Amino acid sequence: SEFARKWVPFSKKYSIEPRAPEWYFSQKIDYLKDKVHPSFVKDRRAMKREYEEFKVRINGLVSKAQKVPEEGWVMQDGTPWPGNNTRDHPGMIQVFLGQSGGLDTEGNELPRLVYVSREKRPGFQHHKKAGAMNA
Amino acid sequence: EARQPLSRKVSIPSSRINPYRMVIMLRLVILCIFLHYRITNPVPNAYPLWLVSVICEIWFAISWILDQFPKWLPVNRETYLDRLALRYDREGEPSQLAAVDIFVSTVDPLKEPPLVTANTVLSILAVDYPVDKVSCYVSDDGAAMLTFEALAETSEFARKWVPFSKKYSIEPRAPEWYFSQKIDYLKDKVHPSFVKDRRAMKREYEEFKVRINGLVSKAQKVPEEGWVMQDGTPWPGNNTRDHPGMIQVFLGQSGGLDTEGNELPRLVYVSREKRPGFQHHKKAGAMNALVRVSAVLTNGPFLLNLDCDHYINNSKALREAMCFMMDPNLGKHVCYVQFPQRFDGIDRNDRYANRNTVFFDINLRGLDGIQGPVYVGTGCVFNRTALYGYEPPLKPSQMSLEKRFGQSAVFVASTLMENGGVPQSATPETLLKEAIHVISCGYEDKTDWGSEIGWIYGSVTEDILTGFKMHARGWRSIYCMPKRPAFKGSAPINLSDRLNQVLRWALGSVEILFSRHCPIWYGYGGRLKWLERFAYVNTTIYPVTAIPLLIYCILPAVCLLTNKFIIPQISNLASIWFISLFLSIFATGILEMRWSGVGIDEWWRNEQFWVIGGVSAHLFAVFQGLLKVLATTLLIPPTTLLIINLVGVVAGISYAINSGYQSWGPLFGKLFFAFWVIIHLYPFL
Numbered sequence: 033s034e035f036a037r038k039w040v041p042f043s044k045k046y047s048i049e050p051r052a053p054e055w056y057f058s059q060k061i062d063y064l065k066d067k068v069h070p071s072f073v074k075d076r077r078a079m080k081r082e083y084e085e086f087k088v089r090i091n092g093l094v095s096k097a098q099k100v101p102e103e104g105w106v107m108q109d110g111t112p113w114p115g116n117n118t119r120d121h122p123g124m125i126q127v128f129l130g131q132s133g134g135l136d137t138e139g140n141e142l143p144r145l146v147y148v149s150r151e152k153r154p155g156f157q158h159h160k161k162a163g164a165m166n167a
Numbered sequence: 168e169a170r171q172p173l174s175r176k177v178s179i180p181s182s183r184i185n186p187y188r189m190v191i192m193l194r195l196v197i198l199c200i201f202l203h204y205r206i207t208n209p210v211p212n213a214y215p216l217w218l219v220s221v222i223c224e225i226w227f228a229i230s231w232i233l234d235q236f237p238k239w240l241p242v243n244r245e246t247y248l249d250r251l252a253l254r255y256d257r258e259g260e261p262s263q264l265a266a267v268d269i270f271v272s273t274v275d276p277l278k279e280p281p282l283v284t285a286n287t288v289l290s291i292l293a294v295d296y297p298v299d300k301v302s303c304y305v306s307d308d309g310a311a312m313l314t315f316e317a318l319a320e321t322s323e324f325a326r327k328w329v330p331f332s333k334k335y336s337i338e339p340r341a342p343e344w345y346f347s348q349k350i351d352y353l354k355d356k357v358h359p360s361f362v363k364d365r366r367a368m369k370r371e372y373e374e375f376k377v378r379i380n381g382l383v384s385k386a387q388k389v390p391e392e393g394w395v396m397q398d399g400t401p402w403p404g405n406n407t408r409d410h411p412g413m414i415q416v417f418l419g420q421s422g423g424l425d426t427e428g429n430e431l432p433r434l435v436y437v438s439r440e441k442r443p444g445f446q447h448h449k450k451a452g453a454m455n456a457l458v459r460v461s462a463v464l465t466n467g468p469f470l471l472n473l474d475c476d477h478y479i480n481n482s483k484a485l486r487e488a489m490c491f492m493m494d495p496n497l498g499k500h501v502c503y504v505q506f507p508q509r510f511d512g513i514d515r516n517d518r519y520a521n522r523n524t525v526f527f528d529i530n531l532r533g534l535d536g537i538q539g540p541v542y543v544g545t546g547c548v549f550n551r552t553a554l555y556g557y558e559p560p561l562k563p564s565q566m567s568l569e570k571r572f573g574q575s576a577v578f579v580a581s582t583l584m585e586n587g588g589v590p591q592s593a594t595p596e597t598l599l600k601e602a603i604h605v606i607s608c609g610y611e612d613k614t615d616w617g618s619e620i621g622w623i624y625g626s627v628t629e630d631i632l633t634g635f636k637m638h639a640r641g642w643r644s645i646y647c648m649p650k651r652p653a654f655k656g657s658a659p660i661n662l663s664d665r666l667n668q669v670l671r672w673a674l675g676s677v678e679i680l681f682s683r684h685c686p687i688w689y690g691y692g693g694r695l696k697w698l699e700r701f702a703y704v705n706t707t708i709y710p711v712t713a714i715p716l717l718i719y720c721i722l723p724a725v726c727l728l729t730n731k732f733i734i735p736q737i738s739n740l741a742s743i744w745f746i747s748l749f750l751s752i753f754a755t756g757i758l759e760m761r762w763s764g765v766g767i768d769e770w771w772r773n774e775q776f777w778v779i780g781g782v783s784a785h786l787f788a789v790f791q792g793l794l795k796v797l798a799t800t801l802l803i804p805p806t807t808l809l810i811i812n813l814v815g816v817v818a819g820i821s822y823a824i825n826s827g828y829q830s831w832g833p834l835f836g837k838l839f840f841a842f843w844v845i846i847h848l849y850p851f852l
C-alpha cells in the first residue's frame with residue numbers, strides 16, 4: 033500500500049500496460065512507443081528506481097520473516113501478533129487505504145484495501161478456498 | 168613523387184579464377200557434347216514429348232551461356248584513404264575536397280515512419296566530411312506538414328547529436344541503430360569523459376524520440392479547417408494534388424551553431440509544385456527537381472542518392488567515393504560509384520533470400536571488371552557532367568543549352584562552372600526565387616530532362632535505364648566494396664512485399680525489352696563494350712526464360728501420367744555424359760563458391776529462388792507485359808504446379824503396383840526427375 037501510494041498516479045497518468053510493476057519493467061517491448069508527454073522519461077526512471085528499492089525492502093521483510101522467533105511474532109507497535117498459532121487464531125480485519133487511508137502523490141484518493149483473516153479454531157472444518165470466498 | 172594512385176584495381180589472383188575459367192570451358196564443351204547427343208537418338212517414334220524437351224534444353228543452354236559469359240574478369244578495388252587525405256585534406260590548411268550534395272527521397276510520412284527519415288538525416292549530417300563541402304536535400308513528394316515538423320525537430324536534435332558523434336567517432340552515427348546494439352560500447356574508448364556524455368546523449372535521444380512520437384500523434388488526425396503553421400499562417404501544402412513549391416533551409420551558414428560553436432552541414436527541405444492533370448514521373452521527376460535545386464543553390468560536383476530507409480553505416484563513405492571520383496587519371500572517365508546494398512535485421516536462415524549476396528558479390532563483381540556495375544538506386548554517387556548528358560573525354564551554343572536544359576538562365580550558367588559552387592554577388596533572396604522557379608511543375612517542357620539527361624522517365628524501375636544510357640556514351644562506373652558497409656537498410660518483413668518487388672523488377676525488365684532503350688539495338692556503333700552489352704541483354708531479357716521453365720516444370724507430371732520418359736532407352740554411352748555433366752555443374756558451383764565466399768547455403772537458396780521466381784513472378788510479369796504491348800495470385804500457379812507434381816508422384820507408384828517387373832528402372836528415373844523438380848520447388852509453396 034505504501035508503494036502503491038506513489039505507483040498508482042504514475043500508471044494512471046501515463047496509461048502504462050500492464051500495470052503490474054514487475055511485468056511492466058521486465059518487458060523487451062519498446063517502452064517509448066506511443067508516448068507524448070515531455071516529462072515521461074525522468075518519471076519512468078524515478079519509478080523504476082523506486083520499484084527497485086521497494087523490491088529490496090520486500091526481500092528484507094521476507095528474510096526477517098524467514099526465521100520463526102522462539103517467543104513468537106511481535107508487531108511493530110509492540111503487541112504480540114494475534115495469529116501466532118495458525119490453527120487457533122481469532123479473526124482480524126485491517127484497512128490500509130481508503131477514504132481516510134491517506135493521499136497519493138497527486139493528492140487524490142486510492143481504492144480501499146482490506147486485509148481479512150477468518151477465525152480458525154481446532155476441530156472445526158473450514159472448507160479451504162470455498163469457505164474463504166464465503167467469508 | 169606524388170603520383171601514387173588513390174585507388175588500385177586488384178585482379179583476382181591466378182589460383183582461383185583460372186580453375187574457374189577452365190571449369191567453365193569444360194562445362195561449355197560438355198554442354199555441347201550432351202546437346203549433340205540429345206539431338207540424336209530420339210525417343211521412340213510418334214512421341215511429341217521429346218521435341219519440347221530438347222527445345223527447352225536448347226533454350227536453357229543458350230540462357231546459361233548468355234549468363235555465364237559476363238563473368239570472365241572479376242576484379243576488386245582497394246582504396247587509399249591516407250593518400251587522399253595527404254593530397255587534399257591537409258591539416259592547418261583549408262580543405263580541397265570536392266563538395267557533395269546528398270539527396271534523400273521520401274513520399275508519405277504515414278507509410279514511411281518519420282523516425283526512420285530522421286535517423287537517416289542524422290546519419291547523413293554526421294558524415295566524416297568537411298561541413299562546408301556537404302549539403303543535404305530532402306525531397307518530400309507528399310508535401311506533408313508532419314515531414315516538415317519532423318525535419319525541424321531533427322535539425323534541432325542534430326545541433327547536439329553531431330558534435331558527440333564527431334568527437335567520439337561512434338559507428339554507426341544513426342542514433343537508433345547505435346543505441347540498440349548489443350556490441351560492447353566501451354571498446355576502443357580512451358576519452359575519460361565518455362561515459363557521462365554517452366548517458367546524457369542517450370537520455371536526450373529518448374526525449375527526442377518522445378517528441379517525435381508526440382508530433383506524429385498530433386499529425387495523425389487531419390483537422391477539418393486544414394493544417395496551420397506554428398506561425399499561424401495556413402500550411403501551403405494543404406492539398407497534395409494542388410500545392411505550390413516550397414523550399415526551406417534549416418541549418419547552414421546562418422542556421423546556427425552546435426554545442427561546440429562550430430557550423431553544421433546545410434539542410435534543405437524542398438517540395439516540388441504539384442498541379443492537377445500534370446504528370447510528375449514520381450521518383451525520377453523528384454530526383455531531377457532535386458538536381459536542379461541543388462545546382463541553383465550549392466552546385467556540388469557530386470550527388471549521393473539515398474532513400475528514407477537507408478542510413479550511412481560507415482562515416483567514411485564519402486572519402487571512399489572521392490578516392491575514385493577525385494583521381495586525376497581515373498575521375499575524368501567515371502560516371503558513378505555504386506556501393507553494395509546491405510540490409511540489417513535479415514533472418515539468419517533468410518527464407519526470402521533478402522540478402523541477395525550472389526548478385527552483389529558475383530554479378531556486380533564480374534560487371535566491374537568490364538565497364539562497371541549497374542545502377543541499382545540507393546547508395547550511389549553520381550558525377551554532374553555525366554548526369555548532364557556530356558560525353559566522357561576521349562582517351563588517346565546558347566540556344567542548344569537552353570533547349571537541352573531549360574529556360575532558367577541561372578541553371579544554365581551554373582552548368583558551365585567547372586569547379587562547381589555558386590558565383591559571388593548572388594543574393595540569397597534571389598537564389599531562393601530562382602530555386603522556386605526551377606522547381607515549378609511546368610518547367611521540363613521542350614527539354615531533354617527525363618529522356619536524354621538526368622533520371623530517364625518511364626514506368627520502369629528506372630535505375631537500370633539511367634545507368635545504361637550513361638554507359639552507352641562510353642562512361643565508366645566504379646564498384647566500391649569497403650570492409651564496413653557504407654549504407655544499410657531494412658529488408659521486407661513479409662513475403663508479399665518481396666514478391667511484389669520481384670514482380671515490379673520483372674515488369675520493368677520486360678518493359679525495357681519492348682522499348683527504344685533495349686540493349687539489343689540501342690547504342691549500336693557507340694562506345695559501349697560488347698561484353699557490357701551482353702550483360703545488359705542478360706539482365707534485360709531474363710524473365711522471358713520463365714516461359715520454357717514452366718513448360719519444363721510441367722514435363723515430369725505428364726511424363727509420369729503418360730508413362731513415357733523424356734530421354735530414350737538408357738545407354739552407357741549416354742550415362743557417362745549425363746553423370747559427367749552433373750559433376751561439371753557441381754564443380755563449377757563449388758568453384759564459384761570458393762572464389763567469392765558466398766557459401767553453399769546462399770548459392771542453393773539463390774538457385775531455388777531463381778526457380779521459384781521464374782515459375783511464380785516472372786511468368787505473371789511476362790504475361791502482363793505481353794498484354795500491355797499487345798493492348799495472392801502470384802503464388803497460385805507454382806503451388807498448383809507443385810501439387811500437380813505431388814499428385815503425379817502418387818500416380819507413378821500406382822503404375823508400379825500394376826506392372827511389377829517395371830517398378831524399377833524407368834519409373835525410378837521418373838521419380839528422380841520429379842524429386843529434382845519438387846526439391847527445386849521446396850522453398851515456400
Ligand SMILES: OC[C@H]1O[C@@H](O[C@H]2[C@H](O)[C@@H](O)[C@H](O)O[C@@H]2CO)[C@H](O)[C@@H](O)[C@@H]1O
Binds near residue numbers: 676
Ligand atoms: O536489387 C536491386 C536492383 O535489383 C534489380 O533486379 C535484380 C535483382 O535484384 C537480382 O536479385 C537479380 O539477380 O538480378 C536482377 C537484375 O535486374 C532491379 O532491376 C533494380 O531495379 C533494383 O534496383
